[PDB]
Amino acid sequence: EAEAHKCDITLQEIIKTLNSLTEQKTLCTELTVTDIFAASKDTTEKETFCRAATVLRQFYSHHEKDTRCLGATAQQFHRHKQLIRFLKRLDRNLWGLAGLNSCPVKEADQSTLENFLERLKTIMREKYSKCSS
What we know:
With 133 residues, this protein is mainly alpha-helical. The protein is built from five helices and two strands; from the N terminus they run H-E-H-H-H-E-H. It has a single domain (1-133), classed as Growth Hormone, Chain: A. The chain has helices at residues 10-20, 45-61, 67-70, 74-98, 113-127, and strands at residues 33-34, 110-111. Keywords: B-cell activation, Cytokine, Disulfide bond, Glycoprotein, Growth factor, Secreted, Signal.
């Protein structure tokens, strides 16, 4: 089924979705998140995708039905379901390519969902330029 590669087209749409996840960078990113980009000795690109894929998992399960991220507006609701569908999509498109179920992401200080979403985009733009071989 593969022809050229599974990193130019698939991962490409995964990067665009990455920037879309930074739309709610104010009320939903006020909580926190492990800093996987705080001390990365020498992990792999597929291991980094699964790690951030687990953190994103809990982000689309509870924060989608939590009131802390809801707010208090009729338009904020219709816009919320939009970020929940884009996030759950990247959940399988990020690690689905990695190939690693076990992903112990419980070793890091309490970073912020903001600085983490920024380092997520950057990491996808410089690391995605090394999938070919």
